[PDB]
Structure 1
């Protein structure tokens, strides 16, 4: 924007309140390993500095460009820098240089605990004793575990967080009033983080060319009743925003986000009739809703494509002279008239249409060349549906657990070279899709699935990326985006895998297993199974799905055995030695 003290420009538009946090995030998303006090200090130190910039724009450094004032204030530590012998010490670099050498250090999976909750009465207690130190830490614990969270969205949560307390902290059993709403939050937040990560990942990995086509797709379905170039307008608007939330430019990311809120609430009419009640609520609750709203009704008369995109004999006339924007119409039109279609599906189609025009505009009699181009669509607009059908029908039989086990093997046979902890975190999550998609009607089961799946396949690629072990994966991950899911399902087994070296400390379990949560114990069964298949890949399931039964009946035998931490080494000795038979 046009301003000298760039700091203050945003400071105003966002407000002292939406600063101390939009800045707490920044530090949290950067230094993650660093404690609470360290971050509140630095924020309550960039606040004073940012207060003098509210005075005279030409003070100390007020003229600077945030990134500068940021990284600098970050090297105010150089203390815990011992935990960073290399990396995060590169403040020697200038601009951009070091700011890049910062967005890189962000750990996608930090070595942290789950946040254990104090009992419900102790939470409300701390909520009163200091209603602000409380809400701050929540905003922080999350932002350090999710370095790529939609920074502004993360604000809205702390709002629903405060409210969740301000209401639920008064009733005979306020306890059971609160949690069922914190959990909605816990998850619903964890879900947003995963979607956003994908958006950022599609920017830093496939430029914005790819990104836009996504918005053109999900912004059409959402606001179908709105001009093509009015959407192509919001699409480009939204892009700049998300580019700056991924780039770490939080303040301006929110500043731009709100700027859109205002705007779309102005052109509320030439956009849809669902923004109504959402504009009448805080600029905070504003942005959020607007994007996660309901789709609007289709157009009355519909040109039903065809003549508009396949029949018009002089196709290339508007193609070789347009390409982009022209294909953008095709998308806008197609997507807007398919609130049932998955976003990834519309793109496979559009990239299919593009694969046709570029092949037909190079042959005699082109206007009759394609024609049967929509003939390609059929298997592709069905294949996904037939897949969701299968795996859902299967999910409703094996149940979430045993199902995650099916994948644990299939996906672990396909690429054993992959980190064991990942194969679990991922496979478990793939199983989690069936739970929150096979509850939907056939029409809406299409997106939810292909979408949630897209998300999870990414947190596979973002994990493997830091530690590349199977170039087969990196092949599926780097080679195209709207070809990721198709790629993996296509992967076959691996005869070139040398069965992992035994290691008994692995298949050795202890009474520690007994004192575990139902899930963190399942996750142990999971991890066990993975390291297992990796040990002798060419093994059938009826055998695994037997050795596993044995183990389950074992862990459940030495958790009920009179007083046994002794049999985990006696019966466990037998189990290992026994299973090796077959």
Structure 2
């Protein structure tokens, strides 16, 4: 391949090429308007077309990193708007691309995307290509680590909605509950992918491989070790490329893997039939979200190879990577009822037991009971899910969220109120999605979603560290994160936050808000109560938050709303300090 840009343009096609180039530049240049990005994509596409025609032509032989970085570094007002990226532009490759990746702005703090059914249908009918382009741009610049090919698929779902609802007489009623649905899927898809890039960033490639082996083995328990290894190998390279901004290489390798899985469908899973008779982007997405295959009847007993065999210490010392790899593969297949992080905890415990037993006088008598060391690792998560799902089913999403906000504020009262509310709210919505499932599917649903919310929190903590306890849980071990976070207790060294009257002061503006923005104001007050009175019992806090809810409802239903807030507000504040003693 003489011209790498021609190669990728030839393989991907103009439509997807333009999309992936837009995403690539949007994820870095988050402040630059859409119009300006379009002009940048047009110039890049023109260069690809020229190179596709004559591969010996000017600068066509240069690397994709060279061409990308050179182009990024020609953008108007770079030093002023993107001072960090501007410093990278001094450097040669591969140092320059490495600098770009380091200084990629994680949370840009742009306004929330509000659907405009009338204006967006108009823009869509006017020019749909540009309308889809704008969607890629808006999502890419808000989620800088979003997988290029996956975002193209979400753009198709976005398109499908707007083709279906714009013809309809009523638009708002048609689009909002679909665009609300699409926004959740974007948040989850973005979160899953941020965990993969975070895992690479924080724990390296060996951790991503072990996670993938565990997950694919659960999804494809029919597949043999050599098949899982092949998929994990190819998928890791895909994940590495997409996470490191190599969208063109990534889109191509992802398409190839999807083509391989579907060609070898019969020996991988019987659930891939639906996925494999679909178009390109829909196929890849379907495989990624595919239901776990039925357990094979012929899954082998593991006690013989991993507990009873007299030469395991020999197998461990000599054939280590294969032996531990085979264990993780085999143990994962037979436990779709376990979370990925639980399976990696069990693997780490298997290894640790072999280290100990194989250093001592009679190893076989020692490691014979290795499987029984897993029992505690399975019960701790199973109990917390049973316990939290009982609470959720009793009190509902709102009070469950409030329960979690109190729990975490007490664990980490140094963390900002918005973050505490966001995390407690998110893990509340986990209760809503997961607790209503069959009891066996709860733990994986819960602890896998917990991994997404904890990764979120750990990314915010990189931006603004507040707690050494949090830094340790976030950086020490991927497998041990949730346990480490669960282990945290109320820091007895913490100084109760100085009481600001203004903090618990409410006005009539609260009454016009939708129900969830109302909740957030009160949930923000709950966090502030725990911050001022952290030794207050969970029951004391439930009482006071009740008084705040009663007060808001009373004054929002008043003749003079502002006179009610102004009169009753200070009284509620004063009595609450005494109630939380």
Length-normalised TM-score, structure 1: 0.95
Partner of 2:373: 376
Change over 3 Å in CA distance of 1:17–1:577 after alignment to 2: same
For 2:497 and 2:32, the matched residues in 1 are separated by 37
Whole-angstrom CA distance in 1 between matches of 2:467 and 2:372: 36
Match of 2:517 among 512, 516, 520: 520
1:386-407 Cα shifts (integer Å, max 9, x gaps): 1111000001112111111111
Tell me what 2:300 maps to. 303
Q: Deviations over 1:125-177 (max 9, x none)?
A: 33211111111111221112111112211111111221222234434546544
Tell me which moved more, 491-500 or 273-282.
Answer: 273-282
For residues 565-580 of structure 1, the aligned pairs below 5 Å read 565-580=562-577
The alignment partner of 1:577 has SS state of helix
* 2:410 counterpart residue number: 413
CA contact (8 A) 1:78 1:89 kept: no
Partner of 2:93: 95
Shift in CA distance, 456/228, structure 1 to aligned 2, threshold 3 Å: same
- Report matched runs for 1:243-282 at 5 Å: 243-282=240-279
* Residue of structure 1 aligned with 2:80, choices 65, 82, 85: 82
For 1:109 and 1:381, how far apart are their aligned partners in 2?
A: 35
Q: Which residues in structure 2 correspond to 1:346-357 (within 5 Å)?
A: 346-357=343-354
1:425 equivalent in alignment to 2:383: no
User: Which sits farther off after the overlay, 91-100 or 310-319?
Assistant: 91-100
2:336 alignment counterpart: 339
Q: Tell me whether 436-445 or 174-183 shows the greater mean CA deviation.
A: 174-183
1:291 lines up with 2:265 in the alignment:
no
Residues 168-183 of structure 1 correspond to what in structure 2 (within 5 A)?
A: 168-171=165-168, 173=170, 176-183=173-180
Contact 2:115/2:179 (8 A) holds in 1: no
Counterparts of 2:547 and 2:277, CA distance in 1 = 60
> Which residue, 437, 441, 449 being the options, matches 1:444?
441
Query: Which residue of structure 2 aligns with residue 211 of structure 1?
Result: 208
Match of 1:143 among 135, 140, 144: 140
From 40, 44, 47, the counterpart of 1:46:
44
- Counterpart CA distance in 2 for 1:509 and 1:475 is 37
Change (3 A) 1:85 1:573: farther
Following the alignment from structure 1 to structure 2, what is the Cα–Cα distance between the partners of residues 44 and 356? Answer: 59
1:476 to 449, 452, 473: 473
**Structure 1 residue 506, shift from structure 2 partner:** 2.1
Tell me whether 1:533 sits opposite 2:530 in the alignment. yes
Give 1:189 deviation, angstroms: 1.9
- By how many angstroms is 1:86 displaced? 4.6
- C-alpha offsets along residues 360-403 of structure 1, whole Å, 9 cap, x if unaligned? 11112222221111111112222211111100000111211111
Match of 1:106 in 2: 104
Contact map agreement 1:88 1:102 (CA 8 A) in 2: no
Q: What is the CA-CA distance between 1:122 and the residue it aligns to?
A: 4.2
* Cα gap change, 1:65 to 1:503, in 2 (>3 Å): farther
Structure 1 residue 89: Cα displacement: 4.3
**Pairwise CA distance, 1:43:** 1.0
> How many angstroms apart in 2 are the aligned matches of 1:383 and 1:73?
52
1:435 Cα offset (Å) = 0.4
Cα RMSD (Å) of the superposition? 1.9
CA deviations 1:25-78 (Å, max 9, x no partner) are 111111222221121121112111222211222333222212222122122224
Alpha-carbon distance in structure 2 between the residues aligned to 1:107 and 1:439: 37
Provide the C-alpha distance between the structure 2 equivalents of 1:453 and 1:225, rounded to a whole number of angstroms: 28
TM-score (norm: length of structure 2): 0.95
- In the TM superposition, residue 459 of structure 1 has moved relative to its aligned partner by 0.6
Contact kept, 8 Å, 1:88 with 1:105, in 2: the verdict is no
Pair 1:567–1:59, CA change in 2 (3 A): farther
- Aligned residues of 2:401 and 2:425 also touching (Cα < 8 A): yes
Partners of 1:75 and 1:89 within 8 A in 2 = no
| Unaligned 5+ runs, structure 2 | none
The question of whether the paired residues in 2 share the 8 Å contact of 1:30 and 1:103 is answered with: no
Q: Is the 8 A contact 2:84 2:103 kept in 1?
A: no
- Which of the two has greater helix per residue? 2
Distance 1:554 1:67 in 2: 59
Tell me what 1:68 maps to.
66
Cα deviation, residue 96, structure 1: 2.8
Paired residues, number: 579
**Correspondence 1:152 to 2:149:** yes
Check 1:115–1:365 CA distance in 2 against 1; reply closer, same or farther (3 A cut): same
> Is contact 2:115–2:176 with CA below 8 Å preserved after alignment?
no
CA contact (8 A) 2:78 2:85 kept: no
Does the residue aligned with 1:146 lie in a helix, a strand or coil?
coil
Q: Provide the rounded CA distance (Å) in 2 between the counterparts of 1:447 and 1:512.
A: 41
Provide the rounded CA distance (Å) in 1 between the counterparts of 2:63 and 2:367.
Answer: 52
